[PDB]
Design a protein around this nucleic acid. Sequence first.
RNA 1: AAAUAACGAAGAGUUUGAUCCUGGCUUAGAACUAACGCUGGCAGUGCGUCUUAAGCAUGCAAGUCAAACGGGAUGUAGCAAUACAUUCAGUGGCGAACGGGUGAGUAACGCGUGGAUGAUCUACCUAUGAGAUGGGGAUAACUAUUAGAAAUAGUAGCUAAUACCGAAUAAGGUCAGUUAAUUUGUUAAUUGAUGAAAGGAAGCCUUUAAAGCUUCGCUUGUAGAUGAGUCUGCGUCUUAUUAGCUAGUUGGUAGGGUAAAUGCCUACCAAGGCAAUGAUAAGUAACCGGCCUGAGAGGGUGAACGGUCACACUGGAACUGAGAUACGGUCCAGACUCCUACGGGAGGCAGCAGCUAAGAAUCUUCCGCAAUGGGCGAAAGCCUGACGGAGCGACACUGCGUGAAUGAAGAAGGUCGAAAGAUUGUAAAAUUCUUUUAUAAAUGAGGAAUAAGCUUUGUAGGAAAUGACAAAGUGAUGACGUUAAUUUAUGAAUAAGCCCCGGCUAAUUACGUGCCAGCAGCCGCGGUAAUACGUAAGGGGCGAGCGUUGUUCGGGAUUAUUGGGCGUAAAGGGUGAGUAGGCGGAUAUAUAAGUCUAUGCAUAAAAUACCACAGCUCAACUGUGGACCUAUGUUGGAAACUAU
RNA 2: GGAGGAAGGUAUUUAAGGUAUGUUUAGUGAGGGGGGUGAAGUCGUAACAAGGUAGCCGUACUGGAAAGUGCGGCUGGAUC
Lengths: 85, 83, 82, 208
Amino acid sequence: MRKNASALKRSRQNLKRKIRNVSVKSELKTIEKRCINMIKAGKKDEAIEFFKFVAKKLDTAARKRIIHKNKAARKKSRLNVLLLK
Amino acid sequence: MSVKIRLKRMGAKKRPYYRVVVMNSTSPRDGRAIEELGYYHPVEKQNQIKIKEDRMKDWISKGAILSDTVKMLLNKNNLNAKS
Amino acid sequence: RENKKELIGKVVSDKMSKTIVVEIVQRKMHPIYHKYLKVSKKVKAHDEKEVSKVGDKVKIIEVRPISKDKRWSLVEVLEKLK
Amino acid sequence: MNRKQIAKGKLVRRFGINIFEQPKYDKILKKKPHPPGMHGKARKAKITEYGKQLIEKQKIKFTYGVSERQLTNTFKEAKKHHGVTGDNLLSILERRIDNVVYRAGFAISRAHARQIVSHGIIILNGRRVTIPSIILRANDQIQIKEKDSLKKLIRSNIEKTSSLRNLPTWIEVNADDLNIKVKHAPSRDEIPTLANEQMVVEYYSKRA
RNA sequence: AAAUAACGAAGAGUUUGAUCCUGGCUUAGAACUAACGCUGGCAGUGCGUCUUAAGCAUGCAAGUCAAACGGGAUGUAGCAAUACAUUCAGUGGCGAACGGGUGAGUAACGCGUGGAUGAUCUACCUAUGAGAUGGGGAUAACUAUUAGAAAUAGUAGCUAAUACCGAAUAAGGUCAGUUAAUUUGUUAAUUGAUGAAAGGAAGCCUUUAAAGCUUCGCUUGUAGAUGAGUCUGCGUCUUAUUAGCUAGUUGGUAGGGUAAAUGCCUACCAAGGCAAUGAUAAGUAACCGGCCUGAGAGGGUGAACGGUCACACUGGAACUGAGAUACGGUCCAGACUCCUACGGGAGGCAGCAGCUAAGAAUCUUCCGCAAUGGGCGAAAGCCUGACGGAGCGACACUGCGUGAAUGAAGAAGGUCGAAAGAUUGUAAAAUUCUUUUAUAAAUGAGGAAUAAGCUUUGUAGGAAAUGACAAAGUGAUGACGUUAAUUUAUGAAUAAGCCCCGGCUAAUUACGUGCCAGCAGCCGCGGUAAUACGUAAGGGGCGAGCGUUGUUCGGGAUUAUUGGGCGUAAAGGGUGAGUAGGCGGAUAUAUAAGUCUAUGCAUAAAAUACCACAGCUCAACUGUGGACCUAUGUUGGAAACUAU
RNA sequence: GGAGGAAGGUAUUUAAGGUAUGUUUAGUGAGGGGGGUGAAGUCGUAACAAGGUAGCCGUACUGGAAAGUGCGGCUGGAUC
């Protein structure tokens, strides 16, 4: 049917925002994975430092509303509890 | 949603009546009424406006948005009540 | 806490883990003849302490879902079958 | 009201009573008592109760010149109130504006008053009205239009009808101003009787 | 004799030679989103693809912001820049998840109703606590170029922003420890870790910048309102000639994921879970407020309107986003249609009209955003096939007219007769009167409020204007529309049919036909004198309608709780013992599930349904109040009866 | 060098498609079976009277056909 400029523009913006969103999400996943792996390594002190770093990344993303702040809070809870262990 | 106070239309062809009503913006013009506030009958020669002043004030405080027509209805009702 | 509904029933099964089955009997209108009918409805309930066993009368409360069927929790044992 | 093919002499003859109160129809009854048709003199078999109910219903319907179906609505409205259903029905029928004019004598017959009211002559409580199915309430006024020809017409009508008929006690007629005032709803006893109204009510009870 | 309450329940035909009873069938009534046949004037309101969730030409139905930003083009000022104004696309903001349509699927927490959410989310709105300090890198547009018929994808160079990304401190943020409460994941305090940001227009004047200031905005936080997700008690079709079903199936321990609980998902550990108190299966169906019917109880039903749910060609999937598993967004597969330069692409009217097919059966390829509502914007303003109206269809509902008053022992004809006369029939004719309607002209309310802008007052603010708010006045604007209604002008002028006449069932005679032709809802009529066939004359019913057919209820007490039966009419099991179930002596106490009451208190949206009072000339229709039931929850009582 | 960022590869889940086996349901099918209406046609006369062998119920056998007979049961059986 008749191509709406609004719809076309919204599709373009959709791709634009998707690239940036997925990049940040993968950032989060891999940073979280490194963190848990050296939690397993038991490296208490740089586990401290890296948890600092990962929490920074998490709630930076949450401020950007890339992901919900509840998701950020849940990840922080669990990961910090594991380091508490 | 953006709760608004507006006029819900009732009546027949060429003889409209309105109910001063409290209900969401997205809701259709004649859908659920979170509350009623009064009536406005423009084709009547008498008793054209009657609204529940206290309830409308309470809803305004809560954060409802008045359409222009209901806003001037409130003004005119204040005038006629004073008179 | 306020108006969570409570039910009183008879424990009909215990061979689960941390779970009991409560058979509750509800009296109901018949729409026409007005005489009541005893309806038997079976619900699952969460029993954390394995307190209750078959044959006794217990009380259960509504909770969040704990499993696919288990949506009730034990509150107290009204009558314990000797 | 295409009542050109319902010549009322036939009706007055079958009913055996002058339901229009016109002397010509009194004369027709005097001349030809028998029912219409070629078998009018022929002996008629006994009539069923359904026939008697129908006879009374038709008496009322043709007396007040109302479509049967409208009369059904009238009965359904009368039944909605407590009290003597026949009285409520007769009152609602009687307070018809054309019937009010006929009672006041401003017209010759009910058909004449119907035409008068339909032709935009009657003025109701300070306004012109053009239809004959108005049900007046207590404390209402008929005035006559501001046209000299109409005023003389009404005066001719009233001077004619004054001798023949009478003038009900629930109407206040002022022939000087051509004013009609309705005081209160008529009582049963102050309504002339031409049919058995509770036979009518029984007839319409079947339609349920 | 009386009092009060009740405001409401009609039958008939038909088994027999005849009778009573049982019993089925039929019938008078009220209805429908109806169709068909004959006929057909108008107005108002409402309704108008019930079938193929079949295929679809065409037009339209979602855009807006230039006061977010960099540019291109144009006109003017200009030497050029730059300004002023217009315009175009791009980046960006918001909307597009609303409004609208349909009922295919779904016997299910889907729906109705009352709750739970210490397992939840919530842009825009209102109030309010704090703030907004400084940098960096790209990128469209643009200029070229590659592949290409086009769709379009790429490539290289340059540029900005309320676009994008770090950095400094954080106010009630998040997470973790600690303590204090609360006792599912709630709140408060402390420590540690850690989370930010946007400025644009206008006025002011130290020249100005600066500096503060107005409005719209931005970051963070809470509260209220609104909506949504999830769960739950109760109600929610037929067939038991559907008897076993389920193996992520049941529960547990961890983990995946979600705003959030849960086999929602996965890995292990057990074999459990459901079921003659109906599991599972098959068939049918969107649900509810309601509609029809009925005295009521019930029965049937889910048109329009309103709420919820599901779907948008068939079947999946994720992205953006506060909100979608997205009707006119994207990706893939399949069928179908169309364009190709043969490499490949384009499309989804169950949106408003309209076309084809199907069907007994349903509309204009219309006007306008004036009012109401919604989106964007500071505003002007733009968009709105929602909605306001118009046209079409007797489809339903309601009202009006087609004349009115005099007028003969009584015109002609028609019909029945013995050819006295009856009947059509005061009907017509004739005379008189009137003009709703018809035509013409004039007059002409109301739907309308004002908006921007302008004038003025007052308040917060301040050094002050601009501006914001409160109030007054001024201030363009009606598609409908030749509006509703009103006043004159001409004149009976413009206007009735349909069904029936044996009983049921209101209404009879004459000809033609002769068990032929035909009628019929039932009983039944027609074989040479048919009130039943066909045509005329009369009579009855209703009336711009009248009949027929289809479907529902009523009459049917013919599924009988109100309110039926089982010796012989259809109906007592061959008999007994007993499980579940139902029911059960006298009496005391306690509980208060049932019951009753204060018709407490609430909830049962609105409309509809009932009673009054109002506005459309009335009515239909429309509006404002007032209630009657009975349904759930809850508070305090009564205790006889059932129950414990 | 993080960023494994983004393409690419691999793996799980999955629509469509294909294969196999049972299962529900709607048409059709040579021929066969009984049922109803039209037949008032053919054969016989079983039942209704004591129906001319009293009738009927359950079961078994037999016969063109209605039916016949054995066993037990019933009167809802004339007559005396």
